[PDB]
Amino acid sequence: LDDWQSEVEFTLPQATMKRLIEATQFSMAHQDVRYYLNGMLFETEGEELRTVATDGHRLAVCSM
Amino acid sequence: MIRLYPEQLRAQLNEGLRAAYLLLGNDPLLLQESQDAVRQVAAAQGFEEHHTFSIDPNTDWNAIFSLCQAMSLFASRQTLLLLLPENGPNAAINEQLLTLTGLLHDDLLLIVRGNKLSKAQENAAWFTALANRSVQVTCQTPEQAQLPRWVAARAKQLNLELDDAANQVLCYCYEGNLLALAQALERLSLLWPDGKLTLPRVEQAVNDAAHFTPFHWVDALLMGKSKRALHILQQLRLEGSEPVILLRTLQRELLLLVNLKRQSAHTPLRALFDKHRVWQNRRGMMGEALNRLSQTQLRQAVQLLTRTELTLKQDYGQSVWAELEGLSLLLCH
Amino acid sequence: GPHMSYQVLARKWRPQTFADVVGQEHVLTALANGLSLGRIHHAYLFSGTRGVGKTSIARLLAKGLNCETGITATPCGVCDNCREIEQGRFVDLIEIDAASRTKVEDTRDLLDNVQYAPARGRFKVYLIDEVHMLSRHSFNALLKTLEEPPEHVKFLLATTDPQKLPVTILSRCLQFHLKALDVEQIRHQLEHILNEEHIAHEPRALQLLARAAEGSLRDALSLTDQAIASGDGQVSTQAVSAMLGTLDDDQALSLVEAMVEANGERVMALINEAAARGIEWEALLVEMLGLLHRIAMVQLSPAALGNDMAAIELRMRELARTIPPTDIQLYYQTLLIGRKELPYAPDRRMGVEMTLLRALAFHPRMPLPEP
Amino acid sequence: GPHMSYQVLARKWRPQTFADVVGQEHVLTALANGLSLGRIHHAYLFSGTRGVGKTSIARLLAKGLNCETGITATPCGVCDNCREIEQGRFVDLIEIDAASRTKVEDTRDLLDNVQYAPARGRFKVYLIDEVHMLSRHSFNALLKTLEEPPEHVKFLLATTDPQKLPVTILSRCLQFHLKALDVEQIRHQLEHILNEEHIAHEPRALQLLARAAEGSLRDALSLTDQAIASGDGQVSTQAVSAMLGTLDDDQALSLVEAMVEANGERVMALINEAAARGIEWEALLVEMLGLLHRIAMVQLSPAALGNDMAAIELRMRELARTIPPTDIQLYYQTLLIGRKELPYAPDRRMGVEMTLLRALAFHPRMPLPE
Amino acid sequence: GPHMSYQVLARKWRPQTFADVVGQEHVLTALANGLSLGRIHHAYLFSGTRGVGKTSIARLLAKGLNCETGITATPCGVCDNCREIEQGRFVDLIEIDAASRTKVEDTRDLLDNVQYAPARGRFKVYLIDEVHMLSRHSFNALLKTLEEPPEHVKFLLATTDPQKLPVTILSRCLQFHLKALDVEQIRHQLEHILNEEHIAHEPRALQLLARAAEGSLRDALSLTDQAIASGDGQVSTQAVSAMLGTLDDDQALSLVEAMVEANGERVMALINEAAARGIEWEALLVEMLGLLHRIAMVQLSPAALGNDMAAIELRMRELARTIPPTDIQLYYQTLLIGRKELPYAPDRRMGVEMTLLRALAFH
Amino acid sequence: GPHMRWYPWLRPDFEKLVASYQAGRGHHALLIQALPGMGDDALIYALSRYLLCQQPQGHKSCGHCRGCQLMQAGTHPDYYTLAPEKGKNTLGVDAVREVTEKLNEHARLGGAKVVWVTDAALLTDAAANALLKTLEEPPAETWFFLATREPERLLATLRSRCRLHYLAPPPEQYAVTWLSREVTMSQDALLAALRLSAGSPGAALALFQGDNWQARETLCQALAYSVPSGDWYSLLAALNHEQAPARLHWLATLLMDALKRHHGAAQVTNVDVPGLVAELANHLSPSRLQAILGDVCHIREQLMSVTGINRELLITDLLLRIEHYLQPGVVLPVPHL
Ligand SMILES: Nc1ncnc2c1ncn2[C@@H]1O[C@H](COP(=O)(O)OP(=O)(O)O)[C@@H](O)[C@H]1O
Ligand SMILES: Nc1ncnc2c1ncn2[C@@H]1O[C@H](COP(=O)(O)OP(=O)(O)O)[C@@H](O)[C@H]1O
Ligand SMILES: Nc1ncnc2c1ncn2[C@@H]1O[C@H](COP(=O)(O)OP(=O)(O)O)[C@@H](O)[C@H]1O
Ligand code: BEF
Ligand code: BEF
Ligand code: BEF
Ligand SMILES: [Mg+2]
Ligand SMILES: [Mg+2]
Ligand SMILES: [Mg+2]
Ligand SMILES: [Zn+2]
Ligand SMILES: [Zn+2]
Ligand SMILES: [Zn+2]
Ligand SMILES: [Zn+2]
């Protein structure tokens, strides 16, 4: 199958990605009724990658 | 492959053993008796370790490689037992049995229990390779024609001197399983160690076998005894017997009765009696069942039966016992 | 007064003697002769209905199979072997309630125990009660310990729901079915228990307790214990009524009686009382039509009434005697039409009330007045 | 617009002093007698229809048992444990949703924690509400504690239908039953509450809501707060009626009187002017059916008419005297059928009009000429 | 780009303010006044038939309740919270479809959720829809959280039919019976929508569409979409008539006049012709019922003629004159019961044939 | 069977039903109402092939691409089918739950997200209410399809979200011509097949290629002895083949034709058995005939609706009641309420 073109391209150190995921992973919903919660938000702006996780009672934001 | 009968297995067991054994049948009394007879034969021949497995759809390859590992070389001799699924071997075990047939040793004595299998199941290659090596035992429940003879012989091996009336009542009360015949025979023998089975002694017990479903409830209606079948229904409701089963019995029997009622005007009774191949001991009651209950009675009874089954089916259950005894009280007229 | 508060009748009156077991003589004689002769099986299963005697017969069998006097059909009840079980603590007797033990770990723990010799008794007894809660693998383990039982190994099994068991377990073990206790058996045992405890009581009270308990003698004893506690150590049919008849449904006998007798004011009061208790109207109509059908069909044969109507016969027979079948058929047609018309009425109360009024208006003996 | 007001009259005006429990004189008398005499059973089962006060009475008794010491008959002043009970702070007050503990393991877990008595109180009380939905095994599990529990633990079970749950539990200690409140008591309570909140009330509205409440103060209070919302802090007759949707019972009375009098033109006039009133046709039919059942009711006793019916009692008497019972039953059957097939009529107005016209054509005395 | 910028009218024209709701003034007034005066109840139960607005009224109530600009009867619609609740991406408005979350696990999850603080809005509101099919265990577990919740918890229940609710569940929440929308309201809202979206129409087709959908605006819009999908993106009388397969009064009156005179052969030939053209049989039965109703009206008082069409009113007048009221009542009852049994009939055409042939019973 | 079978008269409808999607104005839902075996399945399949195809050709699907290559292999990650398992008959909440929970994720291949319910009447009402949210407001580029023999039996809500597209059975002559080209026998049989099946040519094909036709013949012969003798009971063996609904329908069609013959009508359904029709008219009284027809239809409904009902008991009671009715002096029922 033809691969999908990407609109967001970057490259990361393993340390940065590991830190982000360890910082926000425990903060994302499991099977929660709100479908858009069961996941992790990866915002990017300027030279900064930000990561957001919520379950309605918690919030982890990590910016690097 | 040697096909045998449960009574004739012992002699074969005495003459020589076979590495693979198969026990196919529905009646579990002869199944367990044959199994533990073979087991005590093996124990008399030094077999010590006895493994049993319950093969289900959950049972799989990781539930059988331990079996295969078991019978290589551990000590002396051992035996193995399996429990087969309700429908017989499947495609999942079609290969497991083929693998098991690849290793047969005098160290392991193979025992298999189960019910009757489809003719395409013994057509498999593993069964053919196991023909000369195995012995199959027939373990179905035969008809009631040989039932009195078999129970008389059994009571003789149980050291019980039955009377003709005792034989008749014990047969008539337990046409469901050899387990019932056994438990009744041992109950009678323990109660009366002498062994003479007089009819007044054998009738007491607790009741006619159990509260059963068909026998007397239907029979009293056949002769028209309202009180008898009505008390039987009262007892059935006392013990919480399933109304659906009672309805199924009525459906399966009253239809034959209706078939009997027809053609009686233009055909002699006995010709209709033997045309349907209905049992003669049952024919003796079918006679007055047809004589007493007229066609209008049959129509009304079937109509109320259909109404009752309807109201019961859509989860209403509007006093099923009341309508059942209503059916009874119509059939007693 | 405070009788039985120390020992609930069920516990207090656990049969320590075969003569103390009223009923189940078919099983009692079999057990006695099996013990005396020696035809003792490796496993015994009993089937009954709640408070039927299964634990009682199992413990009595434990007494008779491991008494100091030997394997005796008539245990003394005073020896150390007997008194250890009577108090409840017997080393070689293991009583297990399968309701809380459905795991395979604990079943295997007992499986290991099946091998060693008894510490004090002649044989090791593993009583498992209400075995139907055992897991499938626990059932398979039980079968594996059934097939090769050591000599000192005897199994006593008991469950209120015996058909839930697999086929193999039933096949391996010898089964005794305890008949559900008749109302007269329960009443006689209760009367003997109360007389032996030197307390005043009334006969109809015992009859009502036996009817309410529905064949279970332990439940009957618990219910009579409730009666003793509520009545301050007195058994009165008044207190018995106030405890069971209140929870029991006593309706549509007065309703049918008044409707046949054309008592408009009484039937209005009855419907008001029915509405006061917050009962269901469709179920009320079902009960009405059932009673009407029973009354009609008793005319077919007097034996139509079983023991289910123990509190109805005194009224049922008199009502069915003074009634014509044509009138009953008309009433049944009216009530069926009313039940069909019930859902679409303004209120189910209003609908059943209107159906009663339609029945009263078309009363053959007393037609409704018209100006 | 914005605010910090409201308390939900249901959430505000619950009894907390034994003086606000309206009706149920039997259970309050029994509880007062038992508390004053010190005789307390080990299990309490309050039964009855919905919206009556069983939960509130349970809270009442629970706080009457543990309130800064003193075995009072409920009156307890400056009682801390009581104020946390009414504030939702659990103090030896364990409410349990039995549906979350249906399995026998959960009730076994409930059993094993029975020994934790000394928690800023004397008795720990269990409210297993809707107790009739327990499993049989769970019932048996709790029965052992039921017959002989620790002294310090009191069971208070609340249920709607005592028929469902097993007989042995029914018989154990006690079974109190709360009757449905009469519309008169509902009127009193609504009037008193709306007086407490400086809000005017028309007695016609109070009677309308009391009859519209099925003998349950919680229904009455929900409907009354709906009425307050529909107006602007004032309950009025026309607003209440437009809220319920029930038309002029006098409009239906004129309609049925016309049907009796066999004047089809007046029937058409009434039905079209009722159409212009924007009323539900199903409502019109059910109100006419209620009036027909009432006119059959007066045939057996004059007391059939409620207090409100004093407005139209005379017309009831006249119709009852005029019309024989067979004609009332004929009309009732015709209109009841008509309501049964109303959903299948081409239009609800069309179906109601046809049903009335049929009752006219099949008129027992003066039918429509051919 | 290819993301389907078009949205169906049944959802694009969803109400966005209390001034955009068609009808139900009896509940909009109560809700707005409760918002303004300071009386807000912790559990609202909107109940009504399909396509009358329970979800929309509940969503507007949620918009108002947790708007950051106080708590007003008029949501601003430009803020954040209004925008997310309109889009349905707000954390504190949680949509629970009671058909799915009926097992005790999900109910326990909900009761665990209600104990915490909100995230963005003042109130965390559970829009539970189709509540009338929560398992009994779910309702009994939900009683406590529906009775006395925390301060920031409010419940909005939407049910298609109140009957299946346990009555105790009814009693603890505030009932709002959304009345079915009148034909005039539906036709006016359709006129406003279609004029707004620059779509050519004519009032006749609007009246037909309003009549076909028995008081359900969503149904009206569904039929609008069906009527614009066929017929070059426009609403016309011929288009809606073909879509519904409805028939003029002439043919139905031919049927009723042949059947009232026991002309069985003519009746069956008419049915054969109608099948050949392929009409909707339920439409035939409703037209027969309407004609019989008009005949009955004419019989009662001569003033109420058949004047809505008044094309072949001669036949109606003659039939009324020549038939006793009893016979017309029997014909109506027979046709009506037959109409009730169309789904149970093995075929629609044969069910109508059964009903008509049974109407042929009288001589 | 394999990709089912296209039917020639279906070509117009599809064209119309694809135009609404070519313009992009396609309503996400669609409740296709069509008779059993009519050919709605091929329509839904072709629609979904057009929708999920990455390159939609004019009125065709792709011609060549992977996007529907995975469709032909029946393994597309967006295309979901909701049919009850081969061993069951009711579509559970679990399958719709899985499909709707997996819908909230994006489209795997960047195209649409198409769902399909094989038969809507089989949907349990709990499953219907679990699917209500998904139908009312689906995510972007999500479409649906449904198939029903009749829409009125569906839940009041589910159809209200959907457009009730209708498949008109082909004109009588065209259907007869197509069936004649497919199956070869006398036109009376073909007319009976079409009129019995309410016009579904696929159902006529199922009747012919299925054994039932011969069994139908059997029934005719049995009635050829029953009605002249008043001996209906012997029909039992004819009416019990797990096809009691269909066979009772054929019996009711015969009785309809007889009642038509009374009020002499130009056209009747059973044209292969005119002698049987005449005999049925001759022996049976019209009031008795209508009561018997009502009972036949009632029993067929009772059998079709409630599963687990005993067929033998019901049919036996029906035949006994009929035999009773043929006796003079009986009071016949009339439909009411
Ligand atoms: N057949 C019986 N004879 C005498 N008492 C009995 C009998 N059955 C039950 N009981 C009474 O009920 C109490 C509990 O009996 P038990 O045998 O434990 O019932 P279960 O069958 O449910 O284990 C006994 O203490 C005894 O008082
Ligand atoms: N007897 C009563 N006295 C005073 N208020 C009552 C009474 N019964 C019900 N209520 C009102 O109803 C509200 C809820 O009552 P509740 O006791 O929950 O009824 P339920 O029996 O249905 O649970 C209470 O807050 C109170 O305002
Ligand atoms: N009262 C109303 N005013 C305006 N539109 C309405 C109204 N009721 C329903 N609708 C229309 O119906 C569509 C669905 O409405 P909805 O509120 O979801 O009904 P439901 O109560 O059945 O969930 C809306 O998008 C709107 O177009
Ligand atoms: F001890 Be029993 F089984 F109630
Ligand atoms: F507990 Be109640 F029925 F509101
Ligand atoms: F379609 Be609605 F939510 F009843
Ligand atoms: Mg026990
Ligand atoms: Mg409550
Ligand atoms: Mg909705
Ligand atoms: Zn001893
Ligand atoms: Zn206090
Ligand atoms: Zn805002
Ligand atoms: Zn492609």
Author numbering:
A (entry chain G): 119 to 182
B (entry chain A): 1 to 333
C (entry chain B): -2 to 368
D (entry chain C): -2 to 367
E (entry chain D): -2 to 360
F (entry chain E): -2 to 334
Question: What did the publication describing this PDB structure actually write?
Answer:
Clamp loaders are pentameric ATPases that place circular sliding clamps onto DNA, where they function in DNA replication and genome integrity. Because the sliding clamp is a closed ring in solution, it needs to be opened and placed onto DNA by a separate ATPase complex called the clamp loader. All clamp loaders are pentameric ATPases of the AAA + family (ATPases associated with various cellular activities). Here we describe a series of structures of the E. coli clamp loader in the process of placing the clamp onto a p/t-junction.
In micrographs of the sample containing ADP·BeFx, we observe two different conformations of the clamp loader/sliding clamp complex, both with the clamp open. However, the degree of opening is drastically different between these two states. In the first state, the clamp is barely opened and adopts a very tight spiral conformation (overall resolution = 3.9 Å). Therefore, we designate these two states as the Semi-Open and the Fully-Open states, respectively. Unlike the Initial-Binding complex, in the Semi-Open state, all five subunits of the clamp loader contact the sliding clamp. These additional contacts between the clamp loader and sliding clamp help stabilize the initial opening of the sliding clamp in a spiral conformation. Interface contacts between the A and B AAA+ modules and the C and D AAA+ modules are strong, while contacts between the B and C AAA+ modules remain minimal. In the Semi-Open state, there is a gap between the B and C subunits, which prevents the trans-acting arginine finger (Arg169 in γ, Arg158 in δ′) from interacting with ATP. The Semi-Open state, which was predicted by rapid kinetic studies, has all five AAA+ modules of the γ-complex gripping the ß-clamp. The AAA+ modules adopt a spiral matching the tight spiral of the clamp.
